């Protein structure tokens, strides 16, 4: 048997989408799936972790990525989502740097790095209706994002002409994804990316790749619109149908390859007749799409077989 090891925090490994996909991969006659226990991941040395031939491992809050890297170096499995790239995906600055290097359209942006010790000595000038970051001018509306990609306190600043103030986004709490604040001035502590607001029809497009030649997309109400989450009867966020155009399919191909994450989620803003990437999340599955589960498992199984069937002397055809 070819062993596929799944290495992540239990919150992820035991999530319903993961279980749905893993039972389908387990359908491959020559593949056995082994899910690494969180207790083992956290508390055992990598030398004691289970063996695998193919490793699906991904960082989320609390995950010891240093251990995952050392395990991969020790055992040399075929790695589905590259582990070292997952350090970079945690830093919005690194993500945007990569997108630019790949000729991928993204919002015009500027980075404000702040020395916590001297927080006023950085390159920011603020007016009522604009900021200037390293000399670069952002008129309101603009977006302010923490440089840590794991910090979801993204703020949007409204122009005087629209009543000023700001929209404060956050990880969803029940029925809310954001709140309006009368505060008009930007945050005074922390490092931030400042970027142009891209006007959309009021939805985000979420893209989920499984390798460079497959991408599923769906839309949802922009969390900044008023912050009330649209929920269905099962308490799931309302998702709308999307089909990616030829340009967007190429974006997905580029993102998947550039970040070396076979399974990769990212966000598109359809604005001004083009599509801009504003966020790259790495490993992410679609929730509540049976067809996605079927396709994702099929593709991952095929990738595994294509790569490893020869060395195991197993017949494999495309
Ligand atoms: O906090 P994390 O980053 O470790 O996990 C979050 C991550 O899931 P992942 O592991 O990547 O599959 C989000 O997807 P993502 O990667 O596109 O992230 P971005 O926001 O673009 O960066 C997801 O938002 P969404 O895409 O479903 O709206 C969010 O669901 P949640 O707010 O609960 O949404 P509801 O289930 O209440 O509707 C998860 O929060 P928690 O599960 O509470 O931890
Ligand atoms: N430049 C932008 N223009 C318009 N809306 C944006 C822009 N950047 C982020 N947003 C909105 O804010 C939301 C959260 O920002 P995002 O970069 O995806 O951060 P997070 O990592 O917290 O998901 C996006 O889904 C989108 O609705
Ligand atoms: Mg099997
Ligand atoms: Mg949640
Ligand atoms: Mg991918
Ligand atoms: Mg996002
Ligand atoms: Mg993540």
UniProtKB/Swiss-Prot annotation:
The modification Phosphoserine is found at residue 181. ATP binds at residues 92, 145, 152, 171, 195-198, 204-206, 222, 267, 279-281. Changing residue 171 to A/K: Reduces enzyme activity by about 99%. It comes from the Eukaryota. It is found in: Cytoplasm, Cytosol. Substrate binds at residues 11-12, 171-172, 206, 220, 284-287. Bifunctional inositol kinase that acts in concert with the IP6K kinases IP6K1, IP6K2 and IP6K3 to synthesize the diphosphate group-containing inositol pyrophosphates diphosphoinositol pentakisphosphate, PP-InsP5, and bis-diphosphoinositol tetrakisphosphate, (PP)2-InsP4. PP-InsP5 and (PP)2-InsP4, also respectively called InsP7 and InsP8, regulate a variety of cellular processes, including apoptosis, vesicle trafficking, cytoskeletal dynamics, exocytosis, insulin signaling and neutrophil activation. The C-terminal acid phosphatase-like domain binds PtdIns(3,4,5)P3 and InsP6. Despite its similarity with the phosphatase domain of histidine acid phosphatases, it has no phosphatase activity. Belongs to the histidine acid phosphatase family. VIP1 subfamily. It is linked to Deafness, autosomal recessive, 100: A form of non-syndromic, sensorineural deafness characterized by prelingual hearing impairment. Sensorineural deafness results from damage to the neural receptors of the inner ear, the nerve pathways to the brain, or the area of the brain that receives sound information. This is Inositol hexakisphosphate and diphosphoinositol-pentakisphosphate kinase 2. The chain holds residues 43 to 360 of 1243 of the full protein.
